[PDB]
Amino acid sequence: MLETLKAFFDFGKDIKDDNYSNKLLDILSYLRNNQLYPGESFAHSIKTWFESWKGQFTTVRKSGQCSGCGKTIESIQLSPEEYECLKGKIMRLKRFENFIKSRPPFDVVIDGLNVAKMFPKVRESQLLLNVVSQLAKRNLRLLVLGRKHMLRRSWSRDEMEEVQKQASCFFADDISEDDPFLLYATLHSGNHCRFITDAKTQRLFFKWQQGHQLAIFQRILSYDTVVQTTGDSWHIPYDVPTKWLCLHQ
Ligand SMILES: [Cl-]
Ligand SMILES: [Zn+2]
């Protein structure tokens, strides 16, 4: 589909209807609101179309600070109001709710089932413990969302006991869905908590996810990797990617 969209940018160089241009800008806004990134050849067409504006293919510093503008890429951290927005509408089972509310916030919410079943070679009671042990080395509060299945041999427990002594474990019924509990416990704990597993808010969810998801651990950046603009500038990631199209005018 990106292939088709690119072709309309190419047509844009000669089509100087400024009503046509604002439909091309709508595409850019669609990319932003849905965490999509153009291909490299699509990026070239965007740069080229805008220049009919100065474009440069660049990278982003550790506190980017784009190498091209010197401008600072949008922050990945949610504002207190933005976070209280996204939080409210995700919660929009009471044993779990109780479990959370009678306890201090957590730092990492771990989807035990999906984490354990991702490196299929090793036993999954072992894999969970390994993830927990590496994280408990820094004294974080850990909530492991598990199932009654984990406390039934054989998921050697044994090994689950070592898990429960370094992480807090809530064992939901085996039929329960994973996503609701993880989203609740993480968002309830606060903007600081991370996890392992409308248009403005769907964007917020995407910003929140990118800045709070621990990927097996991958580093979380200071800045937000999305198509973005300030009016005088556009910053478009392409080909999360690390290459950026820099536009300023
Ligand atoms: Cl697509
Ligand atoms: Zn730049």
Side-chain angles (χ1 to χ4, degrees), residues 35 37 210 218 221 223-226 237-239 241-242 244:
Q35 275 291 348
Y37 319 104
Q210 176 172 144
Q218 183 180 321
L221 303 176
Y223 49 94
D224 193 9
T225 309
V226 206
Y238 67 93
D239 194 36
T242 57
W244 292 70

Side-chain angles (χ1 to χ4, degrees), residues 88-92 94-107:
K89 332 186 315 166
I90 291 286
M91 322 183 175
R92 181 163 321 157
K94 280 328 170 254
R95 179 176 136 261
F96 172 74
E97 212 183 56
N98 274 8
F99 184 81
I100 295 302
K101 284 185 177 180
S102 71
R103 274 172 184 80
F106 294 96
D107 301 321

